[PDB]
């Protein structure tokens, strides 16, 4: 059952939608990766499959050249082409491992969103879709992650002109959680 909602934040639009992020026609989609940039869970696989094999090659080059063979640190971002995807670019990020660094993980998760949005702003890209970063069966609790995600996006869109930001959720359950949290956040502006 397809569902979405939109709320304007100054001249920006924030949308939450049930959907397959690989099919988004926003200029940018976000891949929540492992630090190698070669894998990751859930959407990562689907993104690599849908983008084609040139993506993995572009990730390997980023790893070799810009990252000097190192993992992308948690909360940072890099950008590649989208290759076969209907989106033009992929911003790749690494979300924190839930309870690895309890006192830093809220900021680190926030960083994924804020660094992605800054890049979009600097590069004058006008639309971006995020997946649910770091969530999953062995991961960050959806209720707290959703709150950090929306809070961070709302605060950024209050202070910056960006355009359209989507949160694309494959799970109806997750969408409903984002919907409640968003209502709660918009009334208490």
Residue numbers in the entry: -3 to 185
Sentences from the paper on this structure:
To expand our knowledge concerning the field of macrodomains, we have characterized Oceanobacillus iheyensis macrodomain (OiMacroD), the first to be described from the order Bacillales. Its phylogenetic analysis revealed that, among the six different classes previously described for macrodomains, OiMacroD is included in the MacroD-type clade, together with other previously characterized MacroD-like macrodomains, such as hMacroD1 and hMacroD2. The subunit has a mixed α/β fold, similar to that of other nucleotide-binding proteins, composed of a central seven-stranded mixed β-sheet (β1–β2–β7–β6–β3–β5–β4) and five α-helices.
To gain insight into the structural and catalytic role of residues N30 and D40, the corresponding alanine mutants were constructed, instead of more conservative mutants, with the aim of completely abolishing the catalytic activity. Surprisingly, these mutants were active towards OAADPr. However, the 86% reduction in catalytic efficiency found in D40A mutant was basically due to a 4.4-fold decrease in kcat, accompanied by a slight increment in the Km value, which was also observed in its ΔTm in the presence of OAADPr compared with the WT. To gain insight into the role of this residue, the D40A mutant structure was analysed and compared with the other OiMacroD complexes, allowing us to identify the presence of two different D40 rotamers. Interestingly, in D40A mutant, the absence of the H-bond between D40 and G36 structure caused a major displacement of the β3–α1 loop of about 4 Å towards the distal ribose, occluding the distal ribose binding site. This conformation was stabilized by a main-chain interaction between residues G36 and N30, which is made possible by the absence of the D40 side-chain, allowing the β3–α1 loop to occupy part of the remaining free space. Soaking or co-crystallization of this mutant in the presence of ADPr yielded no complex. Hence, this study suggests a novel role for residue D40 in the stabilization and organization of the β3–α1 loop, maintaining the proper conformation of the distal ribose site for OAADPr binding. A rigid body outward movement of 5.5 Å (hinge in residues T131 and G135) takes place when the active site is empty, yielding a fully open conformation, as observed in the D40A mutant (salmon). In addition, D40A mutant revealed an additional structural role for this residue, apart from the catalytic one: maintaining the proper architecture of the OAADPr site through the organization of the β3–α1 loop.
